[PDB]
Design a protein around this ligand. Structure first.
Ligand SMILES: [Zn+2]
Length: 539
């Protein structure tokens, strides 16, 4: 990493040459030259390169991604003048706020919008309730009213959320993972409305992005719900269209997910102050943002002054309108669990393979935080002698891919050893045999021969899956060691919980009320002791 010299990383699809011209104006007036680069998979590269105290001085990406960057401590905290804060829209500053502090500068704004055909529809509907009524009109001319990407949440969510559905309630500079508004009466209202639209075949419920794009661009469908990314195509489709506010369900506006292109400063950078000078006084100006926008469109922007001028275009104005009506994309990691838990729910509510409340309750509880009790964890996970006394096995689980997540814990119910429960839990959970998943366990006791047997069978039956098990203690009552040898030859990686593992569990699956991990006496000794026994068993 250089000094007296800025290096900036922006994605290839966003207009870099304009930013480089801005960087040239900076160099001209300053003498500090800046290099604008657009490398490949930079959202991946940067997290690696930054950890070594390297990489660019500034990083441009969607604000959602910057959460994991902030958690890894790769982004410097910024404290810009309350007078400068005002230059931009207040809601854009909440997108760059992680754990009650600012890690980035807001730049641009993306959000969904209602795209309608000006010929077929001179006057688009202001409500979702008009859509069936208007659908049956155009149905008579061999046309459809509305078609969009029904298969995926990002697109379907705005209708769901309009009556007060939400992902995680934003407390104040913070989301709590414990609370989720997925199964709320309003989400049920919006979702049921969607289900009614697909029941009457106002739209097929098989629809995807490509089908809806083909439909609208060839003049078949009057309205589609989509983003600036898709504007250029429709421009070259020769279709006369307009972009406007999403329709209002139950009188309340629909809530897309606002994305926010943001510039963030690498915490490893010595040039932090240089970066701030450049971003504030050069980039975030009418002049700088205009020069950037010329190279490639930014859509709506955070800077009020330039955003009034860009608002002279009603499309961009509509984007911004829907953004302010919408809700900031949460940057927290449990969002991984949100998507995957919603994605599959709406589909099952769409086909009708389950009911609305069933799908939404399933999704509600799947993407939501249940954290243990501290004393329960402390009592159940102790690896000592005389711990043969404790009765019911506990199991903390993480479902990985690393890509996506789901966390939780299970205990012995009526019958049903926890391993069998877990198998039942994940089995209900569909899976793509094309894709690969990585499951990690943390258990009180080991598995039992039966539990062992079944799990090994399950692993053989699902060769896409890979399992690793961290266990505090080994259970018996000849039998169980073999059972563990099956699991061995089955390709399961079995290990005993070391201190680092206890720390991990303590900071992951347990509600500690922000208390550190206190090692109880004889932890390491028993750990290596059980390790000797385990290594003796497996070999
Ligand atoms: Zn068992």
């Amino acid at each position: 990493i250089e000094e007296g010299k800025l290096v900036i990383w922006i994605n290839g699809d966003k207009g870099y040459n304009g930013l480089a011209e801005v960087g040239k104006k900076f160099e001209k007036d300053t003498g500090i030259k800046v290099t604008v680069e657009h490398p490949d998979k930079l959202e991946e590269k940067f997290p690696q390169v930054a950890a070594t105290g390297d990489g660019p001085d500034i990083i441009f990406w969607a604000h959602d991604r910057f959460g994991g960057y902030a958690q890894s401590g790769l982004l410097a905290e910024i404290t810009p003048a309350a007078a400068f804060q005002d230059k931009l829209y207040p809601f854009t500053w909440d997108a760059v706020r992680y754990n009650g502090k600012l890690i980035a500068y807001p730049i641009a704004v993306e959000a969904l919008s209602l795209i309608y055909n000006k010929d077929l529809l001179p006057n688009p509907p202001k409500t979702w309730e008009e859509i069936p009524a208007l659908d049956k009109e155009l149905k008579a001319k061999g046309k459809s009213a509305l078609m969009f990407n029904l298969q995926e949440p990002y697109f379907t969510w705005p209708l769901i959320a309009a009556d007060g559905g939400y992902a995680f309630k934003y407390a104040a500079g913070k989301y709590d993972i414990k609370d989720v508004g997925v199964d709320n009466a309003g989400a049920k209202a919006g979702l049921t409305f969607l289900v009614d639209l697909i029941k009457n075949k106002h739209m097929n419920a098989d629809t995807d992005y490509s089908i809806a794009e083909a439909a609208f661009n060839k003049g078949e469908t009057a309205m589609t719900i989509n983003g600036p990314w898709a504007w250029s195509n429709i421009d070259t489709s020769a279709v006369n269209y307009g972009v406007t506010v999403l329709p209002t369900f139950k009188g309340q506006p629909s809530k897309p997910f606002v994305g926010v292109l943001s510039a963030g400063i690498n915490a490893a950078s010595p040039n932090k102050e240089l970066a701030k000078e450049f971003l504030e006084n050069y980039l975030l100006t009418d002049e700088g943002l205009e020069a950037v926008n010329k190279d490639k469109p930014l859509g709506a922007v955070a800077l009020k002054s330039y955003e009034e001028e860009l608002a002279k275009d009603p499309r961009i104005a509509a984007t911004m309108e829907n953004a302010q009506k919408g809700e900031i994309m949460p940057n927290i990691p449990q969002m991984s669990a949100f998507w995957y838990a919603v994605r599959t729910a709406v589909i099952n509510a769409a086909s009708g393979r389950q009911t609305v409340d069933a799908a939404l309750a399933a999704a509600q509880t799947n993407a939501a935080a249940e954290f243990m009790d501290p004393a329960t964890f402390t009592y159940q996970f102790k690896n000592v002698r005389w711990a043969k006394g404790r009765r019911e096995t506990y199991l903390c689980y993480v479902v990985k891919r690393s890509e996506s997540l789901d966390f939780g814990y299970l205990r012995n119910k009526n019958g049903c050893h926890v391993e069998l429960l877990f198998l039942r839990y994940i089995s209900d959970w569909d899976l793509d045999p094309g894709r690969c998943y990585r499951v990690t366990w943390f258990t009180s006791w080991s598995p039992c021969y039966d539990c062992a047997r079944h799990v090994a069978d399950f692993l053989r039956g699902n060769p896409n899956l890979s399992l690793r098990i961290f266990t505090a203690r080994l259970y018996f009552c000849k039998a169980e060691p073999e059972g563990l040898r099956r699991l061995a030859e089955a390709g399961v990686q079995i290990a005993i919980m070391t201190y680092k593992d206890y720390e991990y569990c303590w900071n992951t699956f347990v509600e500690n009320h922000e208390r550190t991990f206190k090692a109880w006496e004889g932890l390491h000794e028993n750990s290596v002791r059980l390790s000797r026994q385990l290594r003796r068993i497996l070999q």
